[PDB]
Amino acid sequence: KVADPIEGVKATASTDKYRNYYEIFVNSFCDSNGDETGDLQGIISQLDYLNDGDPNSGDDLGVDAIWLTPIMPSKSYHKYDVEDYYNIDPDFGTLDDFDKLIEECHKRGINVILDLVLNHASSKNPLFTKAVEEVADNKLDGNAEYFEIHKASYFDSNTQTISLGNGYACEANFSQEMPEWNLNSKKTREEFTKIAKFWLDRGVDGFRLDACKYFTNKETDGTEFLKWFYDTCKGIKEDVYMVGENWTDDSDIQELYKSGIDSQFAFKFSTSTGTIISNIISQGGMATAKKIMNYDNKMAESNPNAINAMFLSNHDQVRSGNALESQGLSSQKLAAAVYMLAPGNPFIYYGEEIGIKAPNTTNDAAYRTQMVFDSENLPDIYVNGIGDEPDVPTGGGVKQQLADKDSLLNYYRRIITIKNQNPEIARGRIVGTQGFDDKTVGAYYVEYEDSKLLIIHNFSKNDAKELTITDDMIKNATLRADLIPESSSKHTELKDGKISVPPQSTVIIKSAE
Numbered sequence: 001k002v003a004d005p006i007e008g009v010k011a012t013a014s015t016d017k018y019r020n021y022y023e024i025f026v027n028s029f030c031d032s033n034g035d036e037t038g039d040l041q042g043i044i045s046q047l048d049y050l051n052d053g054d055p056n057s058g059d060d061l062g063v064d065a066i067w068l069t070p071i072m073p074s075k076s077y078h079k080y081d082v083e084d085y086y087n088i089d090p091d092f093g094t095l096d097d098f099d100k101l102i103e104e105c106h107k108r109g110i111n112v113i114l115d116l117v118l119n120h121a122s123s124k125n126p127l128f129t130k131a132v133e134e135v136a137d138n139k140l141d142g143n144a145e146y147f148e149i150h151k152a153s154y155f156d157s158n159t160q161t162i163s164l165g166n167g168y169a170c171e172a173n174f175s176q177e178m179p180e181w182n183l184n185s186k187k188t189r190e191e192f193t194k195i196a197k198f199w200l201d202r203g204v205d206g207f208r209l210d211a212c213k214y215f216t217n218k219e220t221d222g223t224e225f226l227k228w229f230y231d232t233c234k235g236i237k238e239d240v241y242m243v244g245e246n247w248t249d250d251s252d253i254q255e256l257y258k259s260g261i262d263s264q265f266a267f268k269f270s271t272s273t274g275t276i277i278s279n280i281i282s283q284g285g286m287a288t289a290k291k292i293m294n295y296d297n298k299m300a301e302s303n304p305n306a307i308n309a310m311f312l313s314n315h316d317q318v319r320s321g322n323a324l325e326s327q328g329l330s331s332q333k334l335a336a337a338v339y340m341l342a343p344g345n346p347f348i349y350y351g352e353e354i355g356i357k358a359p360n361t362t363n364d365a366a367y368r369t370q371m372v373f374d375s376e377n378l379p380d381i382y383v384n385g386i387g388d389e390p391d392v393p394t395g396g397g398v399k400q401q402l403a404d405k406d407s408l409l410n411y412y413r414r415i416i417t418i419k420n421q422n423p424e425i426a427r428g429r430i431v432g433t434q435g436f437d438d439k440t441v442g443a444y445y446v447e448y449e450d451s452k453l454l455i456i457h458n459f460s461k462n463d464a465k466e467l468t469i470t471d472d473m474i475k476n477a478t479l480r481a482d483l484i485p486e487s488s489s490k491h492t493e494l495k496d497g498k499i500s501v502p503p504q505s506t507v508i509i510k511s512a513e
């Protein structure tokens with residue numbers, strides 16, 4: 001039997017901005033009080049699954065940052081329509097519950113960012129209802145100055161608006177319940193400063209910025225607004241971290257990075273139509289390595305400190321398992337390795353690590369089904385328009401997958417441990433690809449502080465590849481890690497400069513020390 005190369009390699013917990021993030025759709029995660037709605041104490045009850053605080057022992061997932069979807073008061077189950085920016089929705093808990101969450105996450109080395117919704121407010125937010133009332137009395141110099149309120153003629157036939165009195169209306173791209181803020185208003189920028197300070201004063205590590213695409217409009221430069229907001233928050237907390245949801249083309253993502261924001265989600269590489277899943281299906285390894293290098297480096301031109309944010313799917317998209325599980329469990333495992341071993345901060349969507357699927361593609365709520373911690377004791381959370389009992393994931397719930405050495409979950413755990421053993425992976429830049437005369441093999445060099453690693457993926461579903469590593473590639477090369485999905489007891493070795501890379505497997509080569 002070939003020895004596991006990561007045995008007796010010490011792992012280290014992150015203490016900086018580089019993290020394996022976990023996105024929690026709060027209503028669907030964990031109910032702690034029987035009302036069929038997930039809540040903050042439910043999250044607290046599962047923190048030892050997410051990270052037990054020891055990267056060298058235990059059976060936790062090992063994620064070291066959480067992004068909570070909106071948690072502030074709102075009449076909806078998703079809460080992107082924010083009615084109060086200074087409290088917790090009562091169904092999720094109180095500010096005391098929130099403070100205990102921060103405390104217990106930080107004890108385990110888990111950072112926390114909040115979903116911050118700056119493009120729009122709820123139509124029932126009192127700041128807005130006051131504006132509606134003033135505008136109906138033809139008063140425009142009061143609360144109307146917070147919002148994107150103009151005469152109706154100002155708006156284009158295709159821009160959704162909320163009709164107000166005296167011939168006015170408010171921009172509202174997403175919904176009649178989501179009137180948009182005027183991001184150039186001095187009053188609005190003072191208010192956003194107060195909101196940010198309120199949450200940063202509670203130990204929040206940063207924000208996920210909703211709907212960044214809609215920051216830009218006819219009179220607003222989204223990059224100027226975001227630079228203003230990011231710089232303001234950095235004055236409050238120098239090491240603040242933000243990731244922007246900028247659901248747009250590569251050129252506009254590159255442009256918004258001039259704001260200085262740490263990260264934007266890499267939509268190009270996500271979903272069944274995106275680069276990673278498409279190329280796993282096509283066995284296009286070389287193409288993938290090229291695209292990851294070129295994208296990460298291009299974004300770093302606009303922000304040299306860019307932290308890319310790769311992901312397979314999020315709460316707005318069909319679950320990645322709906323495309324990958326039918327291709328085989330080893331394809332799901334390879335997909336995890338590919339997106340999580342790219343530079344930056346990958347985002348795991350809750351339940352992805354146990355293969356939750358979406359029951360349909362016609363209701364957003366199908367992307368937000370109930371988390372399954374134990375398939376023998378299913379949860380009871382009501383999911384809008386779907387129901388209150390989940391399907392059993394193909395591999396079982398968390399408990400079952402931890403016990404199966406060949407599970408999807410344990411492959412995610414091993415990827416995280418490998419990253420905790422090799423800080424260059426997340427923190428470096430790709431300085432080149434490595435060809436192995438084979439379109440099926442994708443390989444690249446990631447380098448951080450003059451330490452260079454060679455990451456090699458074999459995208460073949462059925463064929464192993466015998467590769468030769470030379471001193472010109474990696475001097476005094478050794479096998480640093482392997483990820484071999486067909487069996488958790490199968491490992492490889494670098495012997496006489498040759499290494500066999502099994503199907504859909506990943507190896508990491510490093511110089512001897």
Ligand SMILES: [Ca+2]
Pocket residue numbers: 030031032033034035036037038039091
């Ligand atoms: Ca509850």
Ligand SMILES: [Ca+2]
Pocket residue numbers: 052053054055056057058059060062
């Ligand atoms: Ca552990």
Ligand SMILES: [Ca+2]
Pocket residue numbers: 119180181214215216217
């Ligand atoms: Ca806007």
